[PDB]
Design a protein. Structure first.
Length: 51
RNA sequence: AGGAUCAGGAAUCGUCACUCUUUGACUCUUCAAAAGAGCCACUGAAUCCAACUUGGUUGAUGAGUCCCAUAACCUUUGUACCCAGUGAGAAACCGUAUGGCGCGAUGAUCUACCCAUGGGUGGGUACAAAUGGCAGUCUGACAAGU
């Protein structure tokens, strides 16, 4: 029952909340960073694959 | 006799690298513009819209994970302290000719206010804890190549 954008930021949601209430920007990777495919990119390309 | 111009005192190396600093050049480049050896043609490259293509709301792009929401800073409720230390002072006899726990340094003795040495209030300091505060659960439509 959790949507795709919550599969992203499931673990490290502080900077998500710093982005929600303070006018900041969310993480892109989240708990999905340490998965076996996000790090298989390089650089900024590792951002979008987190979606 | 003491001082300053033209023997009381270290300095004779045919360089290899490495690092650092220094300035100068340099492709540029902001202050900030302004001037343009000018025009044609050929040819090349690049950019931008239209176009088309491929991929995409079964989610394209945009994005402060890590500065740790795994927190910081408090806030309330249960405990440990101190304005651990203090250190010499605490209580008045004796089984069948003779034998001892009868204290005590090797420790006796204690753990800012009112109430006659019974109880506690007040502040600092520390932690455990919070489904407590501070403190309110991402976007969503183009993207990219020629």
């Amino acid at each position: 029952k959790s949507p795709a954008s919550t599969i992203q930021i499931l673990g490290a949601e502080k900077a998500l909340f710093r982005a929600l209430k303070t006018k900041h920007d969310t993480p892109k990777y989240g708990l999905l960073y340490h998965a076996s495919l996000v790090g298989q990119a390089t650089g900024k390309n590792k951002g979008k694959i987190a979606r």
